[PDB]
Design a protein around this nucleic acid. Structure first.
Ligand code: DMA
Ligand code: DMA
Ligand SMILES: [Mg+2]
Ligand SMILES: [Mg+2]
Ligand SMILES: [Mg+2]
Ligand SMILES: [Mg+2]
Ligand SMILES: [Zn+2]
Ligand SMILES: [Zn+2]
Lengths: 402, 402
RNA sequence: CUCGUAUGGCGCAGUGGUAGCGCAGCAGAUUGCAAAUCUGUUGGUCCUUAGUUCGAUCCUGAGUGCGAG
RNA sequence: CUCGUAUGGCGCAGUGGUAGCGCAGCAGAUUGCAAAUCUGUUGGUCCUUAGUUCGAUCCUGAGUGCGAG
């Protein structure tokens, strides 16, 4: 009965705090899921409650990757899948905690294997793959497997390129692979959503940036700018590694109310990450695991012990005890959060493309709407209204000539 | 990949009526589950849509059994599995329905493989298995694997006996087998719960019995008593076959007011089945498939086309189209029906046994409560109150003699 | 006119001293029998009355409801 | 009292004919980069008021808040 407990949510609710209670209380090792904490030390700014608070619970896939390195999906795909191994073969229950919920796709069938195949990537194929022009690599995909071709935009470099590579290396179009995909989840899992109202969670996430300088956010980033030298690397790769952490790039140009230049920006970047996190849980995660998840009202921190702690244990208990849970799944307060309307409903289903002939971006290309709902939006945007007006307006230069 | 569309619900909405609407628009075979439709003709009373409005839709597992045969959970566990095969390899899709929701338990990993190891039980083992006394075969189980032993009552013949046979034939205790059981479901499934209010569904189920005589319920049962005469199946083989169908035993005295004797009884038996059906879906099915099911308000039959038909297609559609459904999963009206409280909550979790020393049934044995909740109930039942009262009295006289 | 019977929603057992069984109902169970099987439990205080009595559902008479020649 | 000056949520441009830019904010995508990357979009009656001009956000008269001796 390979069971696995997963804690999802925005930072500022107590995930790395609950993962501790649900650790010894049920014998488990906590795995990480932050495309930041994996980088050697440099805590505080990268968030990670002091070691003397992990209650001796062996964490995995975190604090080990070197600054002058890059962390990708695959990396976690194996490093995580691996930690689960050890934790399992040790009668201990894994507890995956993390903000990059994209990585949660590993805990269940959703990845495309691309290594066991030796499809000789002929020169002609690579030239198309490693092409400088985005539309030429797209049209190629449009031909072979036009299905998946529509699910993406002709400007989605990373995406279109990824799909074609799959068609080439595996031979079998990626459209079919998905049409007959397991989608099931490995190891019986228990998803816990430790959510918190936006307004408060925001006020907290900001006072968290303030009191973040006191703990030594200064030295943190300062010790970060130090590694910046003795190596040198222009923004050609100095914006994809530890560099992303909130506080580095903010004081980067401020080191070649001037304080606000970095303060307000930091507090902003934080919220953005949060907002997206929620979006991914609501539009991706939840819908995929078919609304099977348990919310935890973390809005009021003065009731966390009863609204998130106590509640968590109970739920987590029956989960491990192989006994069906009796918990309502979500407090009446945060009830709509799981409703199809606040989740799956926000998804996209109409992929039919649309092209506006009277509008185009800087790249010269005409605008490309995807979906009736959105195609109709463009046709109503000031943009379209203006181009359409000065169009029929530049035409009125004929009446005054004929 | 291979998908299936089950249709649960009592017998007073249109499960068979809708199983057709979908089986066509989405191309599929309607696998039956009702343990009554699986008998040569005799439909007018065993209920099963006539070929008239059949619209040439293929129906499996039904009408293939003869009056003289005892159908069980295995013959279905095989026939169904086979029927689905054909459908899956014929460019179609299984549209399973049925009334005996128990059998649907086969649509996933649950049962044990007590076939591979056809090990022969030593005389000593069989003697214990095929014992006449229920407590002696139970104590045996209490010893080897006391875990599963508590999940049952010392009077649960069929149950306790079945568990022991699993321990013997497989060697591995049934307690562990369940503690590490898949529980997952084979083939992506879509459960549709075509429910309807109790009051109305009852009024309908009864006018159903009335107009049931007109279609020829008389000849139906009459042609049933005819098969009775041959070999004249004594009350030995009268509860293991078509015999149990409504009308048979009901009108047995009408062939050895006198009309109500069978009328009221019939209408009653009907409701009983319905009530239990709902309970199984609410306490068993739903909880198991983790509240993943779609209700369909069939209370008002004047809105069926919109509340059950239209709605069903839509949901069914995205299901097959491999697109996550956007349907609210259950109309605000019938909302509590899926709530943990109206389902999983009704389950039993405290299995600790309890014995009353002042109470015993006809079998002589003392009462055996299972679970605090219920142990406390017994301690307050009139039964206990009386035995406890007439006890202190016929025991206080001794306290008087001296 | 002759005679028994006249108890939980219905069909029944039963004792001078304060009551039961099955059906139904409610409820739990269900990992080859599930329209089966198992388990628990809510309803009467014995048609009405006056007496017979230390006290009657069970005793006597009667008003009354059914069963018969 | 004499001069600067107020343009969408924040900061800035800008033209005689009825407006932009960066940043926020909102929305969609995501099956080896995801704190990435891609795509779409809502905000102002250009301070108030009165005039020359056919036209006023940009010219002129004061009007009001803000800043300057
Ligand atoms: O710890 P905390 O409240 O920041 O939450 P998390 O660990 O999820 O960032
Ligand atoms: O009778 P009915 O067809 O309306 O109900 P069911 O189809 O469930 O037997
Ligand atoms: Mg933390
Ligand atoms: Mg007396
Ligand atoms: Mg003044
Ligand atoms: Mg922006
Ligand atoms: Zn346009
Ligand atoms: Zn008792």
């Amino acid at each position: 009965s390979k069971k696995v407990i997963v804690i999802a949510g925005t930072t500022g609710v107590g995930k790395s705090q609950l993962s501790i209670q649900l650790a010894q209380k049920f014998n488990g090792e906590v795995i990480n899921s932050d495309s930041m904490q994996v980088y050697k030390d440099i805590p505080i700014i990268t968030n990670k409650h002091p070691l003397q608070e992990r209650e001796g619970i062996p964490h995995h896939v975190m604090n080990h990757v070197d600054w002058s390195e890059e962390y990708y999906s695959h990396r976690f795909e194996t490093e995580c899948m691996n930690a689960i191994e050890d934790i399992h073969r040790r009668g201990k229950i894994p507890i995956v905690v993390g903000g990059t919920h994209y990585y949660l796709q590993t805990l269940f069938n959703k990845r495309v294997d691309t290594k066991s195949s030796e499809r000789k990537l002929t020169r002609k194929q690579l030239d198309i793959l490693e092409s400088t022009d985005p539309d030429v690599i797209y049209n190629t995909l449009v031909k072979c497997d036009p299905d998946i071709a529509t699910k993406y935009h002709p400007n989605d470099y990373r995406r279109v390129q990824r799909m074609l590579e799959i068609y080439y290396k595996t031979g079998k179009k990626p459209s079919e692979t998905f049409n007959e995909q397991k989608i099931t989840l490995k190891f019986d899992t228990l998803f816990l959503w430790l959510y918190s109202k936006p307004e408060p969670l925001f006020q907290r996430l900001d006072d968290r940036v303030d009191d973040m300088l006191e703990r030594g956010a200064l030295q943190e980033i300062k010790q970060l700018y130090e590694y910046y030298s003795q190596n040198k690397f222009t923004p050609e790769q100095c914006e994809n590694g530890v560099w992303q952490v909130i506080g580095f790039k903010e004081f980067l140009p401020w080191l070649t109310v001037k304080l606000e230049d970095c303060i307000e920006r930091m507090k902003t970047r934080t919220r953005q990450y949060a907002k997206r996190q929620v979006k991914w849980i609501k539009k991706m995660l939840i819908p995929d695991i078919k609304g099977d998840i348990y919310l935890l009202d973390a809005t009021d921190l003065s009731q966390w012990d009863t609204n998130a702690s106590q509640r968590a244990i109970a739920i987590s208990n029956d989960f491990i005890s192989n006994r069906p849970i009796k918990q309502e799944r979500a407090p009446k307060a945060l009830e709509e959060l799981l409703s199809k309307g606040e989740t799956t409903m926000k998804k996209l289903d109409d992929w039919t493309h649309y092209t506006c002939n009277v509008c185009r971006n800087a790249d010269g290309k005409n605008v490309v709407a995807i979906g009736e709902k959105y195609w109709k939006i463009h046709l109503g945007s000031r943009r379209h209204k203006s181009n359409l007006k000065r169009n029929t307006r530049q035409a009125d230069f004929e009446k005054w000539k004929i």
